Amino acid sequence: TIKEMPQPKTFGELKNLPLLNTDKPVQALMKIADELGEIFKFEAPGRVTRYLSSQRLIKEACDESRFDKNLSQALKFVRDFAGDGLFTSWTHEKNWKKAHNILLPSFSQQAMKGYHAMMVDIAVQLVQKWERLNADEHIEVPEDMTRLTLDTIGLCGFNYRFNSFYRDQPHPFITSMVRALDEAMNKLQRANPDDPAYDENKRQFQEDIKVMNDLVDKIIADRKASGEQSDDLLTHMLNGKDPETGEPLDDENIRYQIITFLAAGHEATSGLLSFALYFLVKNPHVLQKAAEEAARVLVDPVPSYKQVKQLKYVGMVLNEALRLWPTGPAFSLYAKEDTVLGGEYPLEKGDELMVLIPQLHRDKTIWGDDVEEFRPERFENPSAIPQHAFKPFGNGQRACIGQQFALHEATLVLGMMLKHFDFEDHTNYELDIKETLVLKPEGFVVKAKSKKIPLGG
Template identity: 50%
Template sequence: MDTTAIPHRPGRLPVLGDLIGTNVRTPLQSTMRAGAGLGPIFTRKFFGLEIVFACGIDLVTELNDESRFGKHVGLGVERLRGVAGDGLFTAHTREPNWRLAHDILQPAFSAEAMRRYHSTMLEVAHELTAAWDRATGPVDVAADMTRLTLETIGLAGFGYRFGSFERAEPHPFVTAMIRALRFAQLDNVKLPFVRRALAGSSAQNQADIATMTDLVDEVIEARRREGGEARDLLGLMLAEGHPRTGEHLDPVNIRNQAITFVVAGHETTSGALSFALYYLTRHPELLEKARAEVDAVWGDREPAFGDVAKLRYVRRVLDEAMRLWPTAPGYSREAREDLVLGGKYPMRKGDSIIVPLPMLHRDPAVWGPDPEKFDPDRFEPAAVRKRPAQAYKPFGTGERACIGRQFALHEAVLALGIMLQRYDFEADPAYELKIVESLTLKPSGFTLRPRIRERAAELTSAGR
């Protein structure tokens, strides 16, 4: 792509490019700092590799036009193919298994399927509250949200228990996954000693991938032995053919899809819940507003499936948390043909541009003069209708947008509602938000002390 008309940060050096001042542990946050003040499009360059970023609403609206652009699998996502192969997230759209798996798995996210998953989501949420009821000190929020969402996708999607709340340390799958994601993130680093220090060796990465694939293979083999007519994700992949052609997924792709859903199905939702709790506990008036809605809509009873969608303010809290820190923080688009972006930037077929979502979600042209302010009322229906359609994209865009969006949102609203229904929270006033990156985003070192609310304690003692 011809980048001569695209700005970049001052001080670019020969060979190193924009490396000085870049933190390889936090490439997204480094990009946000580097791009501040440069406008709706800018570049960064490292050892001859120049990357184009677009964060202005007008350019992103063009990039999201499916007739002109499609998903680009590159950089970190391309490296993830070593973990998830041609799974739904990492597959090239041209690969036949993408369309095949997408069409086979769509019924797993229908309204009927969501109703089936609800009881499992409740069951796992009660495992969380049981753990928090026993807690005698602060809890690590991101770690417990990871336990919650890992158990949920394991049970709802595959009938498998990771036993996360029975372990003091993360499940080995999670430990291996975190290292593998970090290795993929840092695979572009041209200094091998830096990459090894931060992400481990290639041998360690292969061992981590083996840990993940071995577990998934065990789960798949157990289901094959059991048989049955389960309509969860794994059941559909094993038993269903394409609705039009009857073609089935091959065993390797089933493994790839299973890894994709376990990783993507819990990493992003756990981050969204963690950020929502962070912002609510920093804004007590908003926390009380959210809790008042839960008390008014659910009262003291266990929520039924239809009760979750009634928590409209709680949903807005999550939407606003994902605006500021979308846990899948960007996507890349490639030109389907030679074209000119924004009437100014020539692109050849196959040229790609990254959309850094935290920057798009802070575009003052859309979000006003104070885009850093946490304000769930940005997602009131009237405000949403006034915004450009492409201004908010936490689940990606177009035909490659997240297939599990409704699953994630139902799980997150249900879990946050249950936490608000049961607990008051004591936060550490000295904590300052620190974000850890491993292709997804989470707050690091964020703890809360959950205290059972008086009304909840009374219900517990009465034998609820």
């Protein structure tokens, strides 16, 4: 029966804003959820949102006939450069539905067979970089994983090589995109957006859009000119027609999808690999068990697709890192119609909800009371996890289109890492989670000792 929604203390016209004075708002909101429970309202001047934390309420939120994906303010600023790509489109936009129908078969578990060789290509480069470090040296984990995922997505996405392992300063495209992403995030905390002190920012953001558009438009035009087929997504987008309308994507939209895959894919996948390595080095017994499987399964100089599929425990490791620290930590929904949530909380059409995924993943009625512990064995039998309890890829038709890709990629790379090196948390690293569009273990570093096992040929 109808309840008032909990809300943290408001401070006059500042409302709840003083409780979020932080560059780590997700982490700050988990602490409010621990105080207030499965649902709370959070008010800033001019904005209201509800934060959901329990599997019980999230399962309702995930009903697509009642709620649909909302573009949060972050996603609307990212739309300045990612346009109506899949990630920053409303569900009702014709290009959302066209791209979705055209691209889905290109992201399935089956489609992974055709990307695997390109993924091995960048994965071998990463292993060789680490084999070639001298004794005195260490690895900057998120930085190398970001080099890996950007290059993998560039190769599989549109057969372009950013050659990140050949560079101290990334390819201009990558500098621009990271900077554009950075600016989108900085605009959120921007008190007075139109003050002249942000004129250089605006100009730089415009310059970064042109850089990104120019490269991608040039590669699209070059592939149409050359007319040749690759195993890449760009080939699928140029030949693909929506079975609903029978129409292909236009060139501009194809550009946006390409910028989208890179922008949406690379940082979350990078974060996942970094957190996985974090948890392994902090849990040596889990590390040994994963390394044992890697040694037993990956008996070839390079992994085949079928071998990657056999790495069950590595898969469990990844899921358990996603349970604790899902690298896209929140997603936003609006009420399609007036509705009552959980039998107690009335909502009007348009009202916004945010799913706080790390807090969902600590629901003790689902996971047990030990929710903070890293235990991959939670995932030994995935069919036994209750529906909507584990949501690191979002929900329904607006769920992560890259989920198979990200998992295949992380499994492959992690298995290769576990196979070829021993690791040492030589600084006793204290976890520091930076928040942007995604989560990542900032400043995470390790030493790898090579097991001297020969590689790909």
